[PDB]
Amino acid sequence: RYKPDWESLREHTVPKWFDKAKFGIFIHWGIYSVPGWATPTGELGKVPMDAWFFQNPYAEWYENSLRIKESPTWEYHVKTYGENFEYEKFADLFTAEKWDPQEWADLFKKAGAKYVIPTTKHHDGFCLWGTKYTDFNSVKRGPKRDLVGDLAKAVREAGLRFGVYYSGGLDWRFTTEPIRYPEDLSYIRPNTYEYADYAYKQVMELVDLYLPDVLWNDMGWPEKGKEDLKYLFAYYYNKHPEGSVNDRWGVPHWDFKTAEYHVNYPGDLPGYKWEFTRGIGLSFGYNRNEGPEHMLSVEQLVYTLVDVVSKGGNLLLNVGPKGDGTIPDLQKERLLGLGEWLRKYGDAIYGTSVWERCCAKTEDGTEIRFTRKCNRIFVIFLGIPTGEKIVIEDLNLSAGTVRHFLTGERLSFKNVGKNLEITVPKKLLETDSITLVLEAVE
Amino acid sequence: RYKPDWESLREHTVPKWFDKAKFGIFIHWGIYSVPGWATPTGELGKVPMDAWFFQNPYAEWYENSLRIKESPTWEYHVKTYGENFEYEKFADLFTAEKWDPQEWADLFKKAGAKYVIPTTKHHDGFCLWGTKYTDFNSVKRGPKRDLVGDLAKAVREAGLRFGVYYSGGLDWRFTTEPIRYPEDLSYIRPNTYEYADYAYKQVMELVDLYLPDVLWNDMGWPEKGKEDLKYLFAYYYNKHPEGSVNDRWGVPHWDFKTAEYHVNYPGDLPGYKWEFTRGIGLSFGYNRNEGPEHMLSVEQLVYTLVDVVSKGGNLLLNVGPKGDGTIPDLQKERLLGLGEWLRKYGDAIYGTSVWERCCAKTEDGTEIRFTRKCNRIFVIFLGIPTGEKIVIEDLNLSAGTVRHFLTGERLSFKNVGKNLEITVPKKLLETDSITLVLEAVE
Amino acid sequence: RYKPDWESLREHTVPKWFDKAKFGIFIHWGIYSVPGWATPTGELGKVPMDAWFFQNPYAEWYENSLRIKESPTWEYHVKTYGENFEYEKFADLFTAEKWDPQEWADLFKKAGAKYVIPTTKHHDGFCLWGTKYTDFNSVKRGPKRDLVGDLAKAVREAGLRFGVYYSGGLDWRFTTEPIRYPEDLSYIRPNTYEYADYAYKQVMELVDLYLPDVLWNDMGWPEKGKEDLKYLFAYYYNKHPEGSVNDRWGVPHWDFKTAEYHVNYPGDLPGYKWEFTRGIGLSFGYNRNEGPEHMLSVEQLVYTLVDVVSKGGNLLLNVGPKGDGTIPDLQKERLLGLGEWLRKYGDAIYGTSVWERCCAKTEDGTEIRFTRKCNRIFVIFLGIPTGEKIVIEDLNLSAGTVRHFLTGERLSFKNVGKNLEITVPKKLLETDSITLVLEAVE
Amino acid sequence: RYKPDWESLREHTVPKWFDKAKFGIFIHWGIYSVPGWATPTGELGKVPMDAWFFQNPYAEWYENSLRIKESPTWEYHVKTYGENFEYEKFADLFTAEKWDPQEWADLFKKAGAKYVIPTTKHHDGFCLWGTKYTDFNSVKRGPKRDLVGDLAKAVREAGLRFGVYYSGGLDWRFTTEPIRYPEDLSYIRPNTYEYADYAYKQVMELVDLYLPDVLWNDMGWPEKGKEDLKYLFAYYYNKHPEGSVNDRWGVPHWDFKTAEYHVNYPGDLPGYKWEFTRGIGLSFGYNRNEGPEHMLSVEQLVYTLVDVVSKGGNLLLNVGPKGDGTIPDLQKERLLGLGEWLRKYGDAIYGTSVWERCCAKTEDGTEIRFTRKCNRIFVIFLGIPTGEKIVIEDLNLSAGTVRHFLTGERLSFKNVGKNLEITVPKKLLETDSITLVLEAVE
Ligand SMILES: O[C@@H]1[C@H](O)[C@H](Cc2ccccc2)NC[C@H]1O
Numbered sequence A, B, C, D: 001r002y003k004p005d006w007e008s009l010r011e012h013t014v015p016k017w018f019d020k021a022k023f024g025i026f027i028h029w030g031i032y033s034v035p036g037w038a039t040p041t042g043e044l045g046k047v048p049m050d051a052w053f054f055q056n057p058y059a060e061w062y063e064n065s066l067r068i069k070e071s072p073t074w075e076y077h078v079k080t081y082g083e084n085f086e087y088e089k090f091a092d093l094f095t096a097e098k099w100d101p102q103e104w105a106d107l108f109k110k111a112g113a114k115y116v117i118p119t120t121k122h123h124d125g126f127c128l129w130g131t132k133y134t135d136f137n138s139v140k141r142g143p144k145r146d147l148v149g150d151l152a153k154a155v156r157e158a159g160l161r162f163g164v165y166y167s168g169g170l171d172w173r174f175t176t177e178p179i180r181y182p183e184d185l186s187y188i189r190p191n192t193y194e195y196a197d198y199a200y201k202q203v204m205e206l207v208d209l210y211l212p213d214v215l216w217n218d219m220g221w222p223e224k225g226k227e228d229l230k231y232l233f234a235y236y237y238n239k240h241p242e243g244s245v246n247d248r249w250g251v252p253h254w255d256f257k258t259a260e261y262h263v264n265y266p267g268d269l270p271g272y273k274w275e276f277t278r279g280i281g282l283s284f285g286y287n288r289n290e291g292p293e294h295m296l297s298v299e300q301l302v303y304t305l306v307d308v309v310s311k312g313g314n315l316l317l318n319v320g321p322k323g324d325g326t327i328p329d330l331q332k333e334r335l336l337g338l339g340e341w342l343r344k345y346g347d348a349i350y351g352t353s354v355w356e357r358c359c360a361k362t363e364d365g366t367e368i369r370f371t372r373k374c375n376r377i378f379v380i381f382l383g384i385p386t387g388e389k390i391v392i393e394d395l396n397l398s399a400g401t402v403r404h405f406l407t408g409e410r411l412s413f414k415n416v417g418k419n420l421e422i423t424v425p426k427k428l429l430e431t432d433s434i435t436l437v438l439e440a441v442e
């Protein structure tokens, strides 16, 4: 039994399943998905926060942007929907007409994901389950359906872990003023006792109805409610020990940390479990303005996951569905392409551990990432070298045998000084897809 | 940007407008205005608090007095309205039948007021705006009108600053026992988390709907809610920097202090901005039992404002309207009379600063008050001397020229020892009204 | 960098070296070592606490015991040393005349310990290093030597890790009344701010002077100083990230938990790192009353270690030296015994991880424990079976091969139903020492 | 009387004398003044903090620097003084052989300073008065003199106000590890209750012995002592109401805020009193490596002061004396320069208030600043224009007359559109020194 205190909850470490899953699908879907619109300005960590909230590239932030008059979103809204059309009104057009959960889970399984996390309530405070705590949810409005639940059955049928995203820190149903600058976030929050009780009841509800594998909170937890978390975590873990919890509660406990786009990205191995999060494009919620110029390429996705994994993390890729319940093809294409590379190279990703170091580079700088599996050292090149002679800078293998991962073919190598040279026959190099993968056994 | 912490809110000082306004109208109007009744016992600071709540001379306290059986109010109520008539029932007779806000603002402008503050919710918890937090408000009951709002438009059209009074500390809708002695106030309060949230939401609502120039709280703020105030003040000031806030919250911040009847009245210059408050009569809410024997005279009003002003304060005079929305003539007379003296002598009051000292007295003790305006020193006599030779005790003017304020007429004066003698020709003395005003230029 | 807050320190998990060490030596050595006397009552968890402190079997508790008049220790003292003989007088008799730190480290290395932790200050508050915060230390009294530092140099040259034990929660130099019942521990403590600073300054000083590998606190941390630990842990981890901290501070953070004698002993796999501690006998400090009847036997030491290791823990075995600095022969014998067994079987102990289950037993009740090392599963019998037929209950191996560990000889086995039967040829059975160890590869 | 609580202390606003003084002298003088060495890296706000403490340009940080092995300061020390030479050894070389406090005060008076504030104790914890709480002070070591008191007597006889600087947040006598990165400041501090008492007792003692006009704390106040400040401020203000306090205590109360070099510098009118501080050069303590290339020029000092004053602030210019007590010539020259300009233009600086705006510029980009004194508006050009035609952008004066300040000569001007043009006859332009100053009366 876990007890309701930080010292006792320290005992709960991140579950083996999570540590091994390596790749998950985040899903930001809500009434904001309907206008599904945002100025695709850039990447968090790259856009000056002085203008960010006024040129918000995150479509889930539509209501906050709409509250800022004379903001691209405001202009777009009045021209498209009209001045008199309140944000909340989108819960009526959000009908998920063409939603098939089994199709999503199927697609996430094909894409190589091992877990899925949908936004159950994002900052606009609209809920995608039949909460008994508010009438602004998907059962009484829009869809008339318990999306969280039906999706949880599907992802589970597909044999995938299911977690929940929940906006503990922000709920615009409790405020009127929009966020215009980062500092605003320190005072424009629900602030009441009532809201702290609401968050607590709602996450308890998610724990009772769905017993998720992950509690992924966002934007901190209401100060007046931080202490409830001792009770909620004990309760949760006691019902579900292999459950997990992220680091965005603003309290002493968490099972794994998080890093967003540029924000918090580790340069080398950190000493704890973490998860990198990002959209395929610049937004989490669907943005009709994003085209391929904005999205990552399959090649880029793979390089990303491999880098995140060689560093001890998991990659939580976000997809942003449309109001009708369909997943844009630009995003479906890319999921399938990552999926495909994972079918071929899964074994060097899933279930792996960090090695002595994460990184290395060749003589002409192709970047190299490492992962472990007991005595087997996977060597992953972000790309496929042209030459057959290959020179890895600063590295000596103690191992006796290096093998070409996809074929098995033993390879010739020798510690040439402070480096290691290996010879890969073009017939092999020609077989790899996106990444030349070697396998060393010391 | 102001931040949600006491140290950062320290930066907000009392707005220039307030410091210069000098005189404001407080308005205590509510369902208590209908019985409009109280035993006119005396002045706060003069009535022994051992009997005060049982002989309450403040008519807005009607419900508290009514809850004390065998109390003059209780007797009067059962004879006039009946045992079976609950206090709350007055919200049905409170119909403001004859209310014209434009007429009030007009009258307050003529009376010389620069700002106005109506009680939006007094201790009986009835609200004079359409709050969404309670059904006991003027839109759903009584008037069927948003009094706060309609009055805010009017006072603003009249070009006057508008603030709000709000009973943060007491709300009898959350208690059943009456206050019988001062000590009772330490435990008979709403006390719940819910009430702290209610106050916070309601003042936020007043800030959102009306963005007042002044947040005038009363009776302290619910202990469980004091910390919200960091957030509310930052929020408020950030929306309205020239906004102001009084000192009755029981937290580290405030823009100006307060003093009631005898309670907290400074003897000389204090080193911060404050505001003296009092009714024209002994009550704030309308009291049909008060006659002129109870009210201040125009002469007394003027002497009061001048004394309060020479000491750095503002005078917040309270008027108590009737249930029909009309302002008793006894009170209208006096407002107009103060107004009249302000038309003549405004320039020695509005926009002034304290001088080296506030006070002085003549040889035969007519009291004298001082105000400044750069190098111009206004010298105000509380009354008009008969003689022409005048002797001001303990004072030497360094200034070269003294002038009779109303005419301009240079006057003859000399430092005669530790005193100053001046000669005012009766033709001049005969021109002043209520106060002989001199003007010195050093 | 770690930051001074529980959330950030959570980032620091137990160092890999500690997780893999499995076996460490504790050393209770102090002026109490001189009288080196205690009644061998029994084991913590088995002696009713109503009598425990009056028949204290822990000899380091001599001063507490002496403070209880008419207690075995009091009588013993009066008779052997006299009434005029204060406990602190032992600091001068504690001369460590025959102490050779390098012999100790040689000794601890032979026995198999991978780390050593001496008491730098026990409840009697005597310090075994030249602290600058007290004169009651080994540099100024007795030994005229920095025991801690001199021992650190030696252990480190033997290639073993060094940690320190510090009695943060109790210090008899700051109290007068002895502990008679467990409940006394709740109010009889130093209690002052001055004591909290002292404790703070002393651990800071140990960090600064010897940068220990483990900070082993005991009896909790002074309530007034609990918040100092955020700073101290951050200070310590930023200077020594591979450093570690136990769980006896009473704050949200720890790297490994502790169990003592019967107290807090897990029956199956917990999910965090812990360490078990006990003496070779019933006391931690030297007890000249203890005979082999009170000590564990090499066989019991071995079974203790295996049991602890199969459950994720480390065993911290305590050694109680004499005031002259020699390690009593009954204890030296036993270390050597354990050390010999480790020489033969250590590869199935050091560097291992837990398996799916920790335990199993033979049809005839010999106890079995498991440990893992990748694909290799070590099956350690707590003793050596007689028959060649071996039936382990409730167990089926999927593994293709099962080898007899010490020789490597493949063995025959088959999953006979819900059990597993293996045949161990007497020649092999006769080869093992104390424990029959098998190796299975899946 | 002030009461010991933030709400009541709010009553104390910044004293009129301080608001009107505008210019003050800071004096960093200590044993660090002896080595008087530092690498002139640059200005705070412009040197990346990742390197800052290893190339510290603030010479008073010598001990911190010395504590970092292989740091310019460490090398410099070892080479010049030796390894066996501890920093505290400088207390004995700090003999102030040529110190004449009255020459200093004469000097500060000529330069224009209206108040002086010497460091009574800097981060190295050496005290420049005969404190009774430490032996590390100027009465017992070095100077054998009460520097603080002797300097207070002199400054006060010169008719200037006296304040004290006290390093409440840092004291290296209580720590061992140096600050290497800004984040260290969060855990490397005295941290003990004993230190909080000490700090408390030492400021109490400065109040008691010299009743300073300003209490200038630095680096925040020990967390354990924050609540002591309610008592101390109340104690101080009740003994000296015209006393004042800066904003580096980290509690709800302060009389004026502070900005340092680039750090916290306002671009336009804030709405509270603040003070700007910087050295004549890059360091506060004497740096014998600094040459004119590192110092501001009299012209830059003047523009600095005008800019600060037009924005509501005071400039606290720092002077760094030598261990013998003489003020280096490059700095004396500059004070005198500033002092001469103040002799001519001071009436447009001392006693002024801010105007509606602080700034404006000429069509040709010469910067302009404004200051007020009732109806008089001073227009200070940061330099002297060449043409006689002067076009100030975005500005219209309602004022009837515009005079050339130093002479009084009426000038011609007209609001040519959105600008204002004035003609300054070269004879006048040639009369001004460093800044063309005009005077406008409305
Ligand atoms: O859209 C949400 C937001 O991007 C947060 C991160 C964030 C950080 C700073 C400003 C806005 C948003 N990550 C989770 C997303 O669901």
Ligand SMILES: O[C@@H]1[C@H](O)[C@H](Cc2ccccc2)NC[C@H]1O
Residues within 6 Å of the ligand: B028, B044, B058, B060, B218, B260, B284
């Ligand atoms: O009627 C209210 C009450 O007089 C408070 C002052 C007060 C003080 C002590 C007892 C009762 C009331 N001032 C504001 C008025 O609206």
Ligand SMILES: O[C@@H]1[C@H](O)[C@H](Cc2ccccc2)NC[C@H]1O
Residues within 6 Å of the ligand: C028, C058, C060, C061, C218, C260, C284
């Ligand atoms: O003597 C110390 C005591 O055993 C603590 C545990 C303890 C618990 C309860 C009573 C006495 C002791 N563990 C370490 C030993 O050094």
Ligand SMILES: O[C@@H]1[C@H](O)[C@H](Cc2ccccc2)NC[C@H]1O
Residues within 6 Å of the ligand: D028, D058, D060, D061, D218, D260, D284
């Ligand atoms: O050396 C002191 C330091 O400049 C503080 C400000 C400061 C801030 C950050 C690092 C070092 C110093 N201001 C007063 C000076 O005496």
